[model samples]
Target: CSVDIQGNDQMQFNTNAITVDKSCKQFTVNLSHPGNLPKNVMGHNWVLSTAADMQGVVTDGMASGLDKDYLKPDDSRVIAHTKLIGSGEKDSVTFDVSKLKEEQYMFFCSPHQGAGMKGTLTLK
Candidate 1:
């Protein structure tokens, strides 16, 4: 299963929730930035982790900077993520569905979390 997500110049993602079918062996998240801003000013990436680990990841990520895709290098808490993309750019990430839990998975654009670029993913 897969889903397409968009990030625009307004620092927003098109959706706030995502659902994954339990039958899928793997799931993909396709991210696209359809605005006109550059990476440094309006970059976006999709990051997945437990809701509990979300804050930590975001904090460390901001410090990690854009060169590191705004993510901590070798951060075990990060289940999966896409490379940061700029305007008119796109990126995708696929991960084993088996790793997900019914509890909840939170996702966000690392550098833009403060701008409310976060959401939840659930399996059903």
Candidate 2:
């Protein structure tokens, strides 16, 4: 199934949790930015990785710059991700269910993490 998420100028997301059904062959995340802001000032993206990989992924991602969607080019740590989007823009990414483990993963928007944009992705 596909999960729809929204990011606003408030530096927050509409939800803090998402679940993936084990029966699903693949899962998709649709990320949309509804606020009227540019990607540089109020960019948002959906990045997925193991919980232990979040910090490093975010740090390197920021260093990667906007051209790369705030993510390191060809970063293996990134199991899946969506392109950065601004107001009225949207992006989506799909990942095979087999790529996930039973453990929970972390998901967040790069520009809003410090303001509580983080969330959990559970595979069950």
Candidate 3:
């Protein structure tokens, strides 16, 4: 039904993969930043999209800057997302699990994707 993920100052997410049970009508992802850095320096947010849209989403979001949580506003490619947060901050995003399809899914921290902050997500 839900999961918690921690983002650290080292630019890493505690977990690299997530599974959403099919029985869940809705799924929640809670993102916490336990590090000491500020949002602009080492911000982190959870973003979900189809694997094929991952690269395109990241590339375009970079231009939107941190003010937009490193994501373009109203991005159709974004299936779900959390607000970017700094040290000691937290955010969460919930979406209907029934909307998931057979396509491969991916999740990542936008600005930090280049630092290997992305991971796979799947409906189970």
Candidate 4:
């Protein structure tokens, strides 16, 4: 299945949660920045990782710098991610559904997590 998401200027995502079907062979996430802000000021990206690894991923990702899309370069913990996008820009990522576990996972923007810009993805 495919998911379409948008991030606005208020630091919010259009959808907070996503559900994946285990039967799917692949899943795609499409992210768009609809606001009018620059990347440095209000960038948004869709990052996926295990629930337990979210905090650590965010910490390290933040330190990774914008050049790395605010994520650790080639970090194994990151199952999938999209490039950081600025206003009027878009990005997407597709991954094998088999790579995901039944366990809960998280998705959020690096710059807006604290402001309720976070969400969860569950596979069944």
Which residue pairs come into collision in candidate 3?
none
TM-score to true structure, per model = 0.98, 0.95, 0.97, 0.95
Instruction: Please give, for residues 1-124, the per-residue lDDT of candidate 2 as tens digits.
Output: 8899999998888989999998999999989988889988899998888888888888888888888888888999888988898899999899998999877699987656656788999987
What's every prediction's RMSD, in angstroms?
0.7, 1.0, 0.8, 1.1
> Residue 60 in candidate 2 has what lDDT?
89
lDDT-based ranking, best first? 1, 3, 4, 2
Number of clashes recorded per candidate: 0, 0, 0, 0
lDDT of 4 at 65: 81
Model 2 scores worst on lDDT over the 10 consecutive residues at 108-117
Candidate 3: Cα lDDT at 122: 94
Off by over 4 Å in 4: none
Across residues 1-124, which tens digit of lDDT does each residue of candidate 4 receive?
9999999999889988899987889999999999789998889999888989988888898898888888888899989998999999999899999989778799988656767788999886
Model 3, 25-45: lDDT tens digits are 999999999978999889999
Supply the global lDDT for candidate 3: 0.92
- Residue-wise lDDT of candidate 1 within 1-124, one digit each (tens)? 9999999998899998999998999999999999799998889999999999999999999998988989999999999999999999999999999899868789999999988999999998
